[PDB]
Every structure is written in C-alpha cells, then in structure tokens.
C-alpha cells in the first residue's frame, strides 16, 4: 500500500488506461481522482490550468508531462521527474516543488504571506472550499465572514466598502501560477 498518490488531469481516457497499467506494473503509487494531502505527482495530458494543476502547485507536487510515465515504463522503473515538469505553462510548479522538497515539517507556501485576510465568496468558481484551500496552502489567510477581510474574492452581493478590494478568482489563480502577487487593478469586479 503506497503512501503517495498520483493524480491525472486533462488526461484522455486511452492515456489514463496507460497510466493505470504503468502504475499496476511499477507500483509506488495509488491513483487518486483529485489532488489531496497524499498527492506527490500530478500528470497532465494537455497543459490546461485545471483545479488539479492548481492544487498540485499549491502543494508543491511534481506537475508532469504524460511522457514521464511512458519513459518510466520503457526503463522499467520510475525515472527522475525534472525533465518532465510543465514549467513553461506553470512557472510556479517547479518553484513550489523545489521549496516543498526543502521543507522540514509540512509544506506551506508563502506567496500570500504578506496579503491581508481574504474572504472567498460562497458563489466562487473554482468552488469556495477548494479556492480557500488554495489560498491557505499558498500562505494566505482565510476569513469566515466579509467584515474580517480587506480582500473579497468572487461574486459578492453585499454592500461594497471603500477600503476593500473586490477581485475575481482569477487574481488568486494567476498569482499561484506565476508565483507573483498580481496587480489588483487588472482583476477588479
């Protein structure tokens, strides 16, 4: 019973069959439907910014090309991941993976550590709990109520307050993906 999971994302069904077959032959992983606390490797069939890619970066997983599985099968063992990192599409991926690997104790990002508390709309996309998870894992502070926050993320129907930034979910996601706190001005609702 492996203690790490691997997740497939943007994976055509015929490629999923191959990954499942390779993991059955090389062992070393359980396959999980979505990124979770045990996940170390996220395999993408097409470099689309899915929720699993985002969660993968937030947790400092390997975010890898499908070709990693193909080469590993050919050589009869799991090979080095570095050559297969999807850094062109997701520049933060190798950055967060490097820092996670250096961590003593559970890893937590610091991208958002200098931001004030954020309230995430219950109506957000990606869904509220996952978007909060992303904010927390990337070193941000999550408010339970809007009065607690200087930043409110996603659809919000309450009365607006003057010293609060009302930003799209994309502000969070583009920041995570680039490992830069994006300029709020471009994400205003």
């Amino acid at each position: 019973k492996p203690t790490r999971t691997l997740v497939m994302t943007s994976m055509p069904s015929e490629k999923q069959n191959v990954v499942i077959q390779v993991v059955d032959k090389l062992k070393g992983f359980s396959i999980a439907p979505d990124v979770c606390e045990t996940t170390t490797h996220v395999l993408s069939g097409k470099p689309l910014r899915t929720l699993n890619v985002l969660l993968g970066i937030a947790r400092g997983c390997w975010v890898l090309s499908y070709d990693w599985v193909l080469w590993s099968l050919e050589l009869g063992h799991w090979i080095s991941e570095e050559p297969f990192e999807l850094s062109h599409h997701f520049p933060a991926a190798p950055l967060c993976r490097s820092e996670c690997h250096l961590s003593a104790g559970p890893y937590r990002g610091t991208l958002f550590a200098d931001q004030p508390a954020m309230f995430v709309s219950p109506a957000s996309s990606p869904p509220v709990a996952k978007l909060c998870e992303l904010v927390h894992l990337c070193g941000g502070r999550v408010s339970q109520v809007p009065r607690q926050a200087s930043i409110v993320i996603g659809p919000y129907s309450g009365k607006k307050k003057a010293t609060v930034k009302y930003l799209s979910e994309k502000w969070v996601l583009d920041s995570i993906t680039q490992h830069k706190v994006c300029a709020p001005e471009n994400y205003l609702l």
Binding site: T50, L51, P126
Partner: peptide
Amino acid sequence: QASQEY
C-alpha cells in the same frame, strides 16, 4: 468530459 480549465 474534461476537467474545467480555470
């Protein structure tokens, strides 16, 4: 069907 791109 595909996982949603964000």
